[PDB]
């Protein structure tokens, strides 16, 4: 299989960290020096990493059996298909949200004999001591479902930590999957802008975020539909970087040069400390040009 | 350019009518006589039909500005990116849910200055006279948001119609958009049955319980829209293959209109007994005359 990227306009594709349409590209010197997102993580040759699903249907979802304990109610986690989650292996079940150091307001439904609004639960997952998805359990506040009830849970909105240790939401940080007790195993690796003057390209989507450092915006490193594409093709990586053009869909005019690294993320060079890809139209298409050296100097993108 | 289907296990893919993992395949001698789903509709050469999005991020969502009326408040619809929705182009905004003749229990959030639980609204959309998706407005009960508030709404669960004209939910039926639709699909003959990819979904009193049928995995839609492979025959012959063992588990024909058929053994359950972790693989272009080996138990 020759390497390719989807011929789909960027603004028809999803964020890989929340189920929301991409509406912007951005670079961030402050937040973009190192990222370790666990969702939207895949190699150019199709190797899934972290908690990354193939399908958006699994993204920002939790499944578990309800427990009632002295310390609070919560979920003994399963995979979304109900199959057993193997603790102390993956950071969390596949599709588990990777937005750290904030409150998750979520919606849960009974997977068995759903009768209506009494089988829908608005719950709050805090990232405190009892948040231990790597050990196979999280505590949920305002969870009234009976013990051993099987629940599928969707992320509704995120807000600053209940315990008031910070007053804003940083979507650039990932959860402590093993709580204070352990670093989680099989984390997708840290990513850094590799090349000369290069900045990691973040695909931005709007999401209900209370007091976001970037407002109601969530960054990711790859459109979700790109993940399914790479997992499908399993195309061999034949060079150090894939040179892409971001092209006008109608004229095929090259609007900018980007490098995709084997680690499954994309860089650009901004125009003399400009906003880089932020000023580009969002209806464009990425197109594979050739395999290039990691040293390949990208022509600056965007306005000065 | 050679036609292909995604080399991805079905159980890792989504329904194209609800955002839920595929957990079964089925045929139906009652429900599969005619289908006209508006989501999961695409040609094998990659032409989107009905309200079908490329991305699951657009599926089963509604966006609109709140209006207040004496008959009931509601939404003047936009597309999900917030751009204006025009009638006469499509049956409804892209990704508009296509589960007919039932109550839609939905969660709306403010797209501007989201403050928390006071900008999250649990609303009810009935399919009655004030349901006008084609015109670009729907009535919503239990909606307290201010006039002209921009809301993005997702489907939470479905239940029997409020006006009680029926006491079950049939997810095989599509909504009345007005008086543009992706065309009807029929079984083409010789015992060929339309394959339905089933996903679990909160459904109160479902005719098939808590199950939603579609004709394509969502990720197949994005694949065809990407590839745009010329259709070179009357049907794409597929093998449903164990990705480990590489063993052919059964034969299927995918038609240019973007649906699959199989032939059940002795009027049995057809693909229902097959494992759900298999992958479809393109074998060749065949004629309508190609007779599929029967699949399943009797
Ligand atoms: O502050 C971040 C949290 O905001 C929201 O929760 C807050 C909300 O539930 C209000 C409702 O009045 O209560 C807050 O707790 C207060 C409490 O009201 C005071 O009496 C007490 O002295 O202080 C506490 C904490 O400062 C509560 O924080 C969201 O729902 C949460 O997810 C957080 O984002």
Author numbering:
A (entry chain A): 230 to 533
B (entry chain B): 230 to 408, 415 to 533
Authors' own words:
NoV VP1 can be divided into two major domains: the N-terminal shell (S) domain and the C-terminal protruding (P) domain. The P domains form the outermost, dimeric protrusions of NoV virions, which plays critical roles in receptor recognition and host immune responses. HuNoVs recognize human histo-blood group antigens (HBGAs) as host receptors or attachment factors that play an important role in huNoV host susceptibility. In this study, we provided both phenotypic and structural evidence to show that huNoV DSV and VA115 recognize a group of glycans with terminal galactoses as ligands.
The results showed that two oligosaccharides (117 and 373) bound well to both DSV/VA115 P-GST fusion proteins with significantly higher binding signals compared with the remaining 583 oligosaccharides. Interestingly, only one oligosaccharide molecule bound in each asymmetric unit of the complex structures, since the remaining oligosaccharide binding pockets contain steric hindrance for oligosaccharides at crystal packing interface. The positions of the glycan binding pockets were located at the outermost surface of the P protein near the interface between the two P monomers, similar to the typical HBGA binding sites of other GI huNoVs. In DSV P protein, four amino acids D332, H334, S388 and P389 form the “bottom” of the binding interface, while residues Q393 and H396 constitute a side “wall,” S346′ and T344′ from the other monomer form the opposite “wall”. In DSV the Gal interacts with all four conserved amino acids (D332, H334, S388, and P389), as well as a variable residue Q393, forming eight or seven direct hydrogen bonds. Additionally, the Gal indirectly interacts with H396 and S346′ through water molecules. Similarly, mutations D332A and S388A of DSV resulted in loss of the glycan binding ability, while mutations H334A and Q393A of DSV reduced the binding affinity. Mutation P389A of DSV also retains nearly full glycan binding ability, since this residue interacts with the trisaccharide through the main chain carbonyl group. The structural data showed that the two GI.3 huNoVs bound non-HBGA glycans using terminal Gal as the MaBS, explaining the mechanism why these huNoVs could not bind HBGAs.
